[PDB]
């Protein structure tokens, strides 16, 4: 109903912004029927020094600001990342500023970080603090997504103050260095960048008290070069940082791209995606020997998507843009899509699934 019917009708009513706006109030209100698929121990994962009871997480750029995280564990997903947040409150670009592709069953958007910022995410979620940790212990734990402002003349200080404000409420945190709507934050994707900024958020992330230190993972770009991908690679062992989200959106255009707006500036995400993504995590995974956790987000849409995204080396995925074309039943669909393919492929859970490519 939701794919052949509501969304396709409503779509056809609100830009895709308002549109937005409208499923995040929506959602925070709790407007959704609860879930009705229950998650088998099958596609239980432990990893991040966390229980996740499923796999399946929303990607960062849905709840900007945190206002819908308990919604978005009613819809069914076994982790929410919340973000990207940013120090100061700012605007980002002028509308419009997002894009449908139906015909691809893509977006593109050139947001730019727009951020309630830090102070305020940060009262918002200490008031449901406790709430979260009994989430978390329950298998449903939080993430919490960094940037930068616009104006900042100090990237590495920005993160750090992240790090400081919302490290203390966050099961882990991101260091979101692959938007491609921010000037210049993809060059800190470069080895030295990234081994000096790394090395900053590490620091002030270990002088959290014991309970309030989280995982600290960085979010890439699916438009790396090989030699950028080895010294991410490279910095990661060298810094011991906990994980990888793989990836961000596009700057690329894929060949085929059908839809009036593909020339649109911005990041490009869902299904052109897909593969791309899934190709990076395959890298990523090999190039750190399969010791660092990755999260596979990019095109996920359903149960097979995600598979392959395990089985090329994601211990858990994400999925956002397969949310604004399929509403959310999609999230129930791709976790029991999995159960199936798994039990059909041999795999006793998730786990038994994650690197299986390249064994
Ligand atoms: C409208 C929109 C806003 C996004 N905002 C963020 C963001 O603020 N921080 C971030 O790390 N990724 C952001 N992303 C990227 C997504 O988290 C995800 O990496 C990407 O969309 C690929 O997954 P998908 O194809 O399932 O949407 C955004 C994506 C979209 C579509
Ligand atoms: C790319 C910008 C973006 O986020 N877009 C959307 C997000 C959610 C929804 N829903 C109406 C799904 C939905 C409905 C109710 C609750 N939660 C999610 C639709 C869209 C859309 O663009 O049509
Ligand atoms: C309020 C301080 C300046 C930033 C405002 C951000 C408004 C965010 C509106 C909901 C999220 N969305 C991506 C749909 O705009
Ligand atoms: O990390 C990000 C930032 C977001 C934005 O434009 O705010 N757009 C994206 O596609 N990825």
């Known amino acids: 109903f939701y794919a052949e019917h509501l969304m396709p009708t409503l779509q056809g009513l609100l830009d895709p912004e308002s549109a937005h706006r409208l499923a995040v109030r929506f959602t925070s209100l709790g407007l959704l029927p609860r879930a009705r698929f229950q998650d088998s121990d099958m596609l239980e994962v432990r990893?991040?020094?966390h229980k996740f009871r499923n796999p399946?997480?929303?990607?960062?750029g849905?709840?900007?600001?945190?206002?819908?995280?308990?919604?978005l564990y009613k819809m069914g997903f076994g982790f929410v990342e919340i973000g990207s947040v940013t120090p100061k409150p700012q605007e980002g670009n002028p509308r419009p500023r997002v894009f449908?592709?139906?015909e691809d069953q893509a977006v593109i958007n050139r947001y730019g970080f727009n951020s309630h910022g830090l102070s305020v995410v940060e009262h918002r979620l200490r008031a449901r603090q406790q709430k979260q940790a009994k989430l978390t212990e329950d298998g449903l734990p939080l993430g919490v997504n960094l940037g930068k402002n616009k104006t900042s003349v100090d990237a590495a200080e920005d993160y750090a103050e992240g790090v400081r404000v919302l490290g203390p409420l966050a099961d882990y945190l991101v260091v979101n260095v692959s938007?491609?709507?921010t000037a210049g934050l993809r060059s800190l994707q470069g080895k030295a960048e990234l081994r000096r900024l790394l090395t900053k958020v590490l620091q002030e992330r270990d002088?959290?008290?014991r309970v309030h230190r989280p995982a600290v993972?960085?979010?890439i770009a699916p438009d790396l070069t090989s030699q950028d991908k080895e010294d991410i690679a490279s910095v990661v062992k060298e810094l011991g940082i906990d994980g990888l989200i793989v990836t961000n959106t596009t700057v690329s255009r894929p060949a085929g791209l059908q839809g009036a707006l593909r020339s649109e500036t911005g990041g490009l995400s869902g299904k052109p995606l897909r593969d791309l993504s899934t190709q990076t995590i395959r890298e990523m995974y090999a190039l750190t020997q399969g010791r660092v956790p990755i999260i596979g987000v990019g095109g996920v849409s359903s149960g097979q998507d995600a598979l392959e995204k395990i089985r090329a080396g994601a211990s858990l995925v994400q999925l956002y843009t397969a949310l604004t074309f399929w509403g959310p039943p999609v999230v129930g669909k791709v976790k029991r899509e999995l159960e199936a393919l798994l039990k059909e492929q041999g795999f006793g859970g998730v786990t038994?699934?994650?690197?299986?490519?390249?064994?």
Do not use: M, T, W, Y
Not at 56 to 60: E, K, M, P, S
Not at 63 to 70: C, F, I, L, N, S
Not at 352 to 359: F, L, M, S
């Open 217 to 219: 993972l960085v979010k």
């Open 47 to 49: 990893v991040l020094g």
């Open 179 to 181: 938007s491609p709507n």
């Open 100 to 102: 449908r592709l139906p």
């Open 56 to 60: 399946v997480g929303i990607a960062a």
């Open 62 to 71: 849905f709840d900007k600001h945190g206002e819908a995280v308990d919604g």
């Open 207 to 209: 002088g959290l008290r």
């Open 352 to 359: 038994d699934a994650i690197g299986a490519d390249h064994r």
